[PDB]
Amino acid sequence: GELKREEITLLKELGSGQFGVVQLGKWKGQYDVAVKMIKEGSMSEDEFFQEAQTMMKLSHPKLVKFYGVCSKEYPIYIVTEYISNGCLLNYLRSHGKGLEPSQLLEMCYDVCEGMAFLESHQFIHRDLAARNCLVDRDLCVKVSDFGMTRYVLDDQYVGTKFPVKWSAPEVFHYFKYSSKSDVWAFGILMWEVFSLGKQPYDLYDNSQVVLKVSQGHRLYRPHLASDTIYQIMYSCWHELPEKRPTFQQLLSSIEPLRE
Numbered sequence: 001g002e003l004k005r006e007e008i009t010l011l012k013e014l015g016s017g018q019f020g021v022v023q024l025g026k027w028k029g030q031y032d033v034a035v036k037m038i039k040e041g042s043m044s045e046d047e048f049f050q051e052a053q054t055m056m057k058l059s060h061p062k063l064v065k066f067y068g069v070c071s072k073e074y075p076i077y078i079v080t081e082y083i084s085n086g087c088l089l090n091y092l093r094s095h096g097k098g099l100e101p102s103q104l105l106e107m108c109y110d111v112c113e114g115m116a117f118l119e120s121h122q123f124i125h126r127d128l129a130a131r132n133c134l135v136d137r138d139l140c141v142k143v144s145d146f147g148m149t150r151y152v153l154d155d156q157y158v159g160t161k162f163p164v165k166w167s168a169p170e171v172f173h174y175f176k177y178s179s180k181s182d183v184w185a186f187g188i189l190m191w192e193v194f195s196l197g198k199q200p201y202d203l204y205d206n207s208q209v210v211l212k213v214s215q216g217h218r219l220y221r222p223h224l225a226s227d228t229i230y231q232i233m234y235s236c237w238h239e240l241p242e243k244r245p246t247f248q249q250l251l252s253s254i255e256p257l258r259e
């Protein structure tokens with residue numbers, strides 16, 4: 001729902017997000033928040049504000065908590081809880097010396113559990129990647145910004161920022177987004193986690209990745225991934241969406257491996 005703009009105090013810039021500037025703030029003199037600044041003309045506002053009511057209801061412990069919006073003037077505020085360790089990708093890249101396989105599996109489990117919740121509500125993320133998940137002070141991973149690419153108005157010029165390297169073939173060929181394309185992206189995220197934040201298909205440009213993935217190329221097993229864990233991420237990358245597991249099945253598959 002709608003928040004009172006003056007009940008948000010902006011404290012410092014967190015950086016430039018996919019959707020604009022993001023600020024650390026305080027809400028109601030009590031709660032630590034992140035505030036996404038949404039500029040005029042950047043979003044299909046009608047569609048977004050309908051979905052903003054959906055975002056508010058889609059609450060889960062492994063989803064970043066959405067508090068509300070300030071929508072009556074620009075910039076629009078999207079207000080979420082503050083998650084202190086920032087994006088999962090940079091966490092991996094700066095904590096690899098201390099991270100062990102059991103913790104890496106727990107990170108994947110957290111994301112899978114949030115995604116199973118979204119799947120159960122027929123909600124498609126569209127842009128799952130380690131860069132888009134957040135790590136809290138207790139190393140719980142939370143899914144963030146789910147669904148937000150749908151309301152972006154700017155041409156992505158599919159040089160492009162379009163996330164080909166996380167995209168199932170039906171996404172890069174047909175732009176067909178589904179919970180099964182989210183599953184493909186989840187497998188790529190599992191690879192990012194177990195590789196301690198490597199870039200997928202590092203030596204290759206987007207055109208090379210479309211051809212190689214179309215021809216059956218898949219990411220190699222990270223050193224820290226067991227055969228069982230590799231089989232889980234690899235199962236996410238079937239050419240056919242109907243041959244990929246659901247997030248409910250993946251969650252089932254990961255649970256017995258936790259330590």
Ligand SMILES: */C(C)=C\C(=O)N[C@H]1CCCN(c2c(F)cc(C(N)=O)c3[nH]c(C)c(C)c23)C1
Nearest residue numbers: 014015016017022034082083084086087089131
């Ligand atoms: C990783 C590869 C990226 C990254 O951390 N990017 C930044 C860009 C600025 C905004 N960032 C951001 C955010 F959007 C939300 C939160 C939050 N809900 O707490 C957040 N916390 C931190 C510490 C950052 C940097 C955050 C992500």
Ligand SMILES: [Cl-]
Nearest residue numbers: 195222223224
């Ligand atoms: Cl590796």
